[PDB]
């Protein structure tokens, strides 16, 4: 009985997220029928620390069996697409690696990893590059997002 709604994420410079092969998202400008190739996120609202403007949340991809997860690589938190049993998920009580804080700093969304605080879902300035986990908010990358609701 978890509250999950469907949507598409877009970055502050108007890039969309698409699938780049089985376990990676990329951010690029889409025009016209290209735009039907954007990934739809099933964002499941989950239990965790609710501070001022932060709402805990999880991010799966409509029936691909995939959730966005933060894991360590070379002792560095990294964004990864993670397959999972679809009869189990979505759930309220979920492993911190799948969990993001939905921050609303301006009139825009940040997504901070719950396991790695101060690490955000980020895009590059150059289009068609990976969605990654970025360690600064005050660096040269894009951490600021718009959401557009889909049913």
């Amino acid at each position, epitope marked *: 009985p978890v509250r999950s709604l469907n949507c598409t994420l877009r970055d*502050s*410079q*108007q890039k969309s997220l698409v699938m780049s092969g089985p376990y990676e998202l990329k951010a*690029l*400008h*889409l*025009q016209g029928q*290209d735009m039907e*190739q954007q990934v739809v996120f099933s964002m499941s609202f989950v239990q965790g620390e609710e501070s001022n403007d932060k709402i805990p949340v999880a991010l799966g991809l409509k029936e691909k069996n995939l959730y966005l997860s933060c894991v360590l690589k070379d002792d560095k938190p990294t964004l990864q697409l993670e397959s999972v049993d679809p009869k189990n998920y979505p759930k309220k009580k979920m492993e911190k690696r799948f969990v993001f804080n939905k921050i609303e700093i301006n009139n825009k969304l940040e997504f901070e990893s719950a396991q790695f605080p101060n690490w955000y879902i980020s895009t*590059s*300035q*150059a*289009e*068609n*590059m990976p969605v990654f986990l970025g360690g600064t908010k005050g660096g*040269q990358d*894009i951490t600021d997002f718009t959401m557009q609701f889909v049913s």
Partner: antibody
Amino acid sequence: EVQLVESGGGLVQPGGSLRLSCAASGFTIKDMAIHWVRQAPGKGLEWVARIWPREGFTYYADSVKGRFTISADTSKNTAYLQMNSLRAEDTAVYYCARFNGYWNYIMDYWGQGTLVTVSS
Amino acid sequence: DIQMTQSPSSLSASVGDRVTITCRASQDVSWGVAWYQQKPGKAPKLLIYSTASLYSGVPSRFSGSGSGTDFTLTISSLQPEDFATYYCQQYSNFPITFGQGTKVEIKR
């Protein structure tokens, strides 16, 4: 000798068609974007369109959307700009240029440009 | 269609001294700004990408700074082969847009 070479330019009638082509030597375009940019006689640069050859993603300036078609043959290492309904306004040197964000190829190589004159 | 107002349109200066070209953005383009040198009748070549990173092979007198809306190109000391026009571009928002450029003419 990393190279983008253009051809197909020249003098056409208004309301005509012309295909420009942009051949890559010294790199494969399969993981590059090819942008087209144009420079009207005694004016600045204006962005026309771009294609990601592998994915087929295309993107047009509003002034050319509908009239022009950008495409790419990865097996010929070559990109295309099909121009239709040509007007005097499309008279320019047309450049093609490569883009790859990861390798900092931010229109680092440009073609020599091909002059397109639309006149009766 | 984000405008990129570039200034001045025309500049003049003598070999060995420093020059500043400025470029202003109609709205916020983050750090997605590049600088291009065009010799007449020739293809532009890349100098600076991502506001301030210097492209492989470019002389280290060429410098880029910027703050979200206001961006600036600096050359610390001109040399022979810098008679050119210089263009700023934003590549973070589509459509990509340029400035009308600035002609750099060497004074004698």
